[PDB]
Write an enzyme that holds these catalytic residues in place. Structure first.
Site, PDB file in Angstrom:
ATOM      1  N   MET B  38       1.179  -0.876   0.413  1.00  0.00           N
ATOM      2  CA  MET B  38      -0.314   0.187   0.236  1.00  0.00           C
ATOM      3  C   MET B  38       1.133   1.108  -0.150  1.00  0.00           C
ATOM      4  SD  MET B  38      -3.759  -1.007   1.490  1.00  0.00           S
ATOM      5  CE  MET B  38      -3.629  -0.263   3.461  1.00  0.00           C
ATOM      6  N   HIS B  42       9.159   0.885   3.606  1.00  0.00           N
ATOM      7  CA  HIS B  42      10.235   0.556   3.962  1.00  0.00           C
ATOM      8  C   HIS B  42      10.764  -0.518   3.602  1.00  0.00           C
ATOM      9  CE1 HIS B  42       7.423  -2.273   5.719  1.00  0.00           C
ATOM     10  NE2 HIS B  42       6.788  -1.079   6.011  1.00  0.00           N
ATOM     11  N   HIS B  45       9.536  -4.596   3.287  1.00  0.00           N
ATOM     12  CA  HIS B  45       8.694  -4.014   1.865  1.00  0.00           C
ATOM     13  C   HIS B  45      10.370  -4.230   1.068  1.00  0.00           C
ATOM     14  CE1 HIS B  45       5.797  -1.267   2.932  1.00  0.00           C
ATOM     15  NE2 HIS B  45       5.133  -2.039   2.730  1.00  0.00           N
ATOM     16  N   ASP B  86       9.291   8.161  -3.357  1.00  0.00           N
ATOM     17  CA  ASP B  86      10.034   8.467  -2.227  1.00  0.00           C
ATOM     18  C   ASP B  86      10.078   6.184  -2.800  1.00  0.00           C
ATOM     19  OD1 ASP B  86      11.290  10.361  -1.378  1.00  0.00           O
ATOM     20  OD2 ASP B  86      10.190  10.049   0.837  1.00  0.00           O
ATOM     21  N   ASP B  87       8.171   6.773  -2.678  1.00  0.00           N
ATOM     22  CA  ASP B  87       8.067   4.494  -3.181  1.00  0.00           C
ATOM     23  C   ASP B  87       9.319   4.187  -4.366  1.00  0.00           C
ATOM     24  OD1 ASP B  87       6.550   4.719  -1.042  1.00  0.00           O
ATOM     25  OD2 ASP B  87       5.115   4.684  -2.119  1.00  0.00           O
ATOM     26  N   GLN B  90      12.482   4.170  -4.425  1.00  0.00           N
ATOM     27  CA  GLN B  90      13.060   3.184  -3.690  1.00  0.00           C
ATOM     28  C   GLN B  90      13.185   1.376  -4.857  1.00  0.00           C
ATOM     29  OE1 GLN B  90      12.787   2.332   0.609  1.00  0.00           O
ATOM     30  NE2 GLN B  90      11.177   4.196   0.201  1.00  0.00           N
ATOM     31  N   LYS B 158       4.778  -9.340   9.854  1.00  0.00           N
ATOM     32  CA  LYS B 158       4.266  -8.699  10.889  1.00  0.00           C
ATOM     33  C   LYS B 158       2.314  -8.301  10.257  1.00  0.00           C
ATOM     34  CE  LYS B 158       4.009  -4.618  12.011  1.00  0.00           C
ATOM     35  NZ  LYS B 158       2.314  -3.983  12.041  1.00  0.00           N
ATOM     36  N   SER B 194       6.983  -0.576  10.447  1.00  0.00           N
ATOM     37  CA  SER B 194       5.043  -0.848   9.543  1.00  0.00           C
ATOM     38  C   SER B 194       5.298   1.005   9.002  1.00  0.00           C
ATOM     39  CB  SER B 194       4.495  -0.404  11.168  1.00  0.00           C
ATOM     40  OG  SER B 194       3.641  -0.020  11.054  1.00  0.00           O
ATOM     41  N   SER B 195       4.596   1.090   8.450  1.00  0.00           N
ATOM     42  CA  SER B 195       3.986   3.005   7.819  1.00  0.00           C
ATOM     43  C   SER B 195       3.343   3.339   8.544  1.00  0.00           C
ATOM     44  CB  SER B 195       3.121   2.634   6.290  1.00  0.00           C
ATOM     45  OG  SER B 195       2.124   1.734   7.035  1.00  0.00           O
ATOM     46  N   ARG B 196       2.851   2.744   9.601  1.00  0.00           N
ATOM     47  CA  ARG B 196       2.088   3.578  10.875  1.00  0.00           C
ATOM     48  C   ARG B 196       3.241   4.712  12.719  1.00  0.00           C
ATOM     49  NH1 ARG B 196      -2.756   0.338  12.915  1.00  0.00           N
ATOM     50  NH2 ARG B 196      -4.060   0.621  11.353  1.00  0.00           N
TER      51      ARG B 196
HETATM   52  C1  LIG Z   1       9.108  -8.020   5.549  1.00  0.00           C
HETATM   53  O1  LIG Z   1       8.753  -7.659   7.194  1.00  0.00           O
HETATM   54  C2  LIG Z   1       7.476  -6.498   6.796  1.00  0.00           C
HETATM   55  C3  LIG Z   1       7.621  -6.086   8.034  1.00  0.00           C
HETATM   56  C4  LIG Z   1       6.384  -5.289   7.948  1.00  0.00           C
HETATM   57  C5  LIG Z   1       5.625  -5.170   6.907  1.00  0.00           C
HETATM   58  C6  LIG Z   1       6.413  -5.354   5.907  1.00  0.00           C
HETATM   59  C7  LIG Z   1       6.835  -6.312   5.992  1.00  0.00           C
HETATM   60  C8  LIG Z   1       5.015  -5.019   4.762  1.00  0.00           C
HETATM   61  C9  LIG Z   1       3.408  -4.392   5.594  1.00  0.00           C
HETATM   62  C10 LIG Z   1       2.988  -3.636   4.914  1.00  0.00           C
HETATM   63  N1  LIG Z   1       2.090  -3.988   4.060  1.00  0.00           N
HETATM   64  C11 LIG Z   1       1.518  -3.882   2.929  1.00  0.00           C
HETATM   65  O2  LIG Z   1       2.298  -2.805   2.475  1.00  0.00           O
HETATM   66  C12 LIG Z   1       0.527  -4.583   2.304  1.00  0.00           C
HETATM   67  C13 LIG Z   1      -0.008  -4.176   0.972  1.00  0.00           C
HETATM   68  C14 LIG Z   1      -0.526  -4.966   0.482  1.00  0.00           C
HETATM   69  C15 LIG Z   1      -1.895  -5.164  -0.368  1.00  0.00           C
HETATM   70  C16 LIG Z   1      -2.258  -6.659  -0.631  1.00  0.00           C
HETATM   71  C17 LIG Z   1      -2.362  -7.117   0.276  1.00  0.00           C
HETATM   72  C18 LIG Z   1      -2.101  -7.436   1.277  1.00  0.00           C
HETATM   73  C19 LIG Z   1      -0.947  -5.912   1.766  1.00  0.00           C
HETATM   74  O3  LIG Z   1       0.125  -5.638   2.524  1.00  0.00           O
HETATM   75  N2  LIG Z   1       4.184  -4.057   6.842  1.00  0.00           N
HETATM   76  C20 LIG Z   1       3.650  -3.343   8.246  1.00  0.00           C
HETATM   77  C21 LIG Z   1       3.200  -1.523   7.997  1.00  0.00           C
HETATM   78  O4  LIG Z   1       3.588  -1.057   6.563  1.00  0.00           O
HETATM   79  O5  LIG Z   1       2.085  -1.559   8.454  1.00  0.00           O
END
Ligand SMILES: COc1ccc2c(c1)cc(CNC(=O)c1cc3ccccc3o1)n2CC(=O)O
Ligand SMILES: COc1ccc2c(c1)cc(CNC(=O)c1cc3ccccc3o1)n2CC(=O)O
Lengths: 276, 288
Positions: B38, B42, B45, B86-87, B90, B158, B194-196
């Protein structure tokens, strides 16, 4: 990772989803265009018309699934398919289709609550879930359904569009008895009086289709009068819709759909209507 | 087939374009890897992208789409971080060759119509208060999988409940893809990526280490059994300034209708001010 035995030009039966998936993929790599014909109980001429339609695509290999709900006799059905030059029959058990029971499922859009969705409000969730599975197992280039279950066919097109599925959906005109009665596994239950009255569904719809030069209201009144001339035909609905089953527009293409109960047997029929 | 320039980042917004490229590539022997995201990328991803690139003969498709259907609220949808520039930067630095960046209109031209209804897991844990959240996730994941037709799709551990539901979707609908779960990437102190995390102030950032501290304390306490594991994690969360726990649950690894045996997953969700944080870990009970 060895492909299951496939003997070209013969009727190959598989009960395991994984086997039919491996064979269908191997076949697609060799040139062939994979056609799927889903079916349920005893094969009838309706079903053979779907087969014939699928057979006419050049380079086709036809897969006929035979699988009862969680939505006759195996001997004759398979004989009939052999006769038609079908090369694959897929005959899974319920357990092989649902190894984890009912879990993730497809939720149809609001159309599923209308028309047939009145007495059977979860029926279409079942059909769409099993269609989606068959489509993923077989991965056909085209999938063939009768226009008889029109609302079903429209929901299937909605499934394919909404979930971005690759497959071409082919609707095939309903096969009918000599007097117009749409083919159905239910027809054999009708006693003579009921079978005679049941010709009123198709007679109403064809009358409406020709009355339609005179507009929507004439088409509907014509169908209604024909239904009213039949005894013991309890009409559940008679509705004129556009072709996607939304509200019928002022002029142009539509579909007229009817359902009625004759004793304990529910019968359905539908037809293309052009307004004016 | 639109243009596809190898060894460059190719960005497609139309689902038909990426579908055509992906098919074209698979038919010349390349295995297609999908990393759904999404955005707001980071290092967690980038771990998914790296795992995908490591598959021999791979081409990596990264999707970026903030899916309105899995949001409830409120201002949650409008609040989600969007850092498109930035996305893509990367992704270019990682040598990704395809980004798929669809519009909401291209994904939902008929609005919400046919959808995926998850099994009963979707009403537990994150789904208890957000009853349609995971129907939205699974509906989007199903679409992305049909559009791209990847051989292998990659998700972080996660969002473990999400990954479990995704394996259910794949099994239950006979999807031909392999699901690869990638271990969570953490900051040096243990905080899950986490994005948050960008919404923690300095004090909340300090206190947020308690979630991973509590979980790793449990995974080690677990030689003494489930109660000791749970009590260790609770002690740590209780010691932490301004951490409001929403749940702490020890489940079987499928999170499903089976009791805990030797292998468990311990899941926590907690509030630091307005920021909800999640984390989870593998737990072996006793002699495991
Ligand atoms: C390998 O270490 C990590 C650790 C924390 C991670 C991740 C990887 C990836 C994520 C965020 N997930 C997404 O962007 C995403 C988009 C999406 C779209 C469709 C279905 C499922 C989907 O999941 N997070 C947690 C986060 O960002 O809160
Ligand atoms: C082309 O002329 C006609 C005329 C009447 C027809 C048909 C064709 C086909 C059918 C019945 N449908 C199936 O068997 C079927 C649908 C389906 C969907 C998903 C999985 C399995 C499935 O099986 N009927 C009506 C009937 O027999 O009551």
């Amino acid at each position: 990772m060895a492909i299951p035995a496939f003997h070209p030009g013969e009727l190959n039966v598989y009960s395991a989803p994984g086997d039919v998936a491996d064979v269908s993929r191997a076949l697609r790599l060799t040139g062939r265009r994979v056609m799927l014909v889903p079916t349920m109980g005893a094969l009838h001429e309706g079903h053979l018309a779907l087969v014939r339609a699928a057979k006419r695509v050049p380079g086709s290999v036809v897969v006929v699934s035979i699988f009862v709900n969680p939505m006759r006799t195996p001997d004759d059905d398979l004989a009939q398919l052999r006769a038609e030059g079908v090369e694959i029959a897929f005959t899974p058990t319920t357990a092989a289709m649902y190894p984890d029971g009912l879990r993730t499922t497809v939720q149809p859009g609001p159309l599923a609550a209308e028309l047939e969705g009145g007495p059977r409000p979860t029926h279409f969730a079942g059909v769409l879930t099993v269609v989606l599975k068959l489509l993923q197992i077989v991965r056909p280039d085209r999938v063939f359904f009768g226009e008889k279950d029109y609302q079903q066919l429209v929901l299937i097109r909605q499934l394919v569009a909404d979930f971005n599925l690759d497959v071409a959906v082919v609707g095939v005109p309903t096969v009918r008895e000599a007097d117009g009665l749409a083919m159905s596994s239910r027809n054999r239950y009708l006693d003579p009086a009921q079978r005679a009255a049941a010709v009123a569904l198709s007679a109403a719809l064809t009358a409406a289709a020709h009355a339609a030069t005179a507009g929507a209201q004439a088409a509907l009144d014509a169908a209604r009068a024909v239904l009213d001339a039949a005894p013991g035909v309890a009409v559940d609905y008679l509705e004129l819709r556009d072709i996607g089953l939304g509200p019928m527009p002022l002029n142009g293409s539509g579909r007229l759909l009817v359902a009625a109960r004759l004793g304990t047997t529910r019968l359905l029929d539908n037809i293309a209507i052009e307004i004016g």
